[PDB]
Amino acid sequence: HPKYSDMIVAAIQAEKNRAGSSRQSIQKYIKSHYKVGENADSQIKLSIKRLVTTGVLKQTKGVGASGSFRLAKSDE
DNA sequence: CGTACGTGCGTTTAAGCGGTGCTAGAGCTGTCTACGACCAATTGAGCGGCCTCGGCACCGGGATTGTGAAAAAAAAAAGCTGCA
Ligand SMILES: [Ca+2]
Ligand SMILES: [Ca+2]
Ligand SMILES: [Ca+2]
Numbered sequence: 001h002p003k004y005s006d007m008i009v010a011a012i013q014a015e016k017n018r019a020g021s022s023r024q025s026i027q028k029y030i031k032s033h034y035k036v037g038e039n040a041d042s043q044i045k046l047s048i049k050r051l052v053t054t055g056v057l058k059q060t061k062g063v064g065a066s067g068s069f070r071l072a073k074s075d076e
Numbered sequence: 077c078g079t080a081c082g083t084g085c086g087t088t089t090a091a092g093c094g095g096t097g098c099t100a101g102a103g104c105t106g107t108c109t110a111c112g113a114c115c116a117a118t119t120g121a122g123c124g125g126c127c128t129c130g131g132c133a134c135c136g137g138g139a140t141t142g143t144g145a146a147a148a149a150a151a152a153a154a155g156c157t158g159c160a
């Protein structure tokens with residue numbers, strides 16, 4: 001298997017559609033070829049929690065925990 | 077009382093001196109990655125409390141033995157001796 005910032009790239013990159021990108025449609029695609037452990041959902045929200053704050057991923061619209069994201073940082 | 081160990085002497089030996097040459101290896105740098113801290117999540121091994129019952133303390137008594145101490149027997153010591 002590959003890492004979870006390896007997995008988060010594959011869903012949003014391949015197709016590009018529902019709610020810009022959001023939490024359910026990412027986890028549906030991700031499970032098909034990561035091969036699911038129980039920790040999948042726990043370390044997929046953690047991967048998002050540190051990727052949104054670093055600059056690799058930037059968020060479109062939300063409040064606190066919920067929302068929707070993109071890949072290209074804002075103004076870049 | 078006997079001699080082992082200090083003292084002082086001459087003979088012998090090699091430590092110490094410095095110098096020189098040759099180099100193992102101490103020690104430093106740069107490159108990459110396996111590995112350990114450090115997250116959040118799952119969870120069962122070990123914690124505190126508490127209950128039972130057999131190990132062990134305790135007694136006791138009476139037999140045994142190990143451990144002396146006294147008194148009694150042997151040997152040796154000291155004083156006499158007399159003798160070839
Ligand atoms: Ca579970
Ligand atoms: Ca206990
Ligand atoms: Ca209890």
Ligand SMILES: [Ca+2]
Pocket residue numbers: 129130
């Ligand atoms: Ca018991």
Ligand SMILES: [Ca+2]
Pocket residue numbers: 130
């Ligand atoms: Ca018993």
Ligand SMILES: [Ca+2]
Pocket residue numbers: 136137
């Ligand atoms: Ca007794």
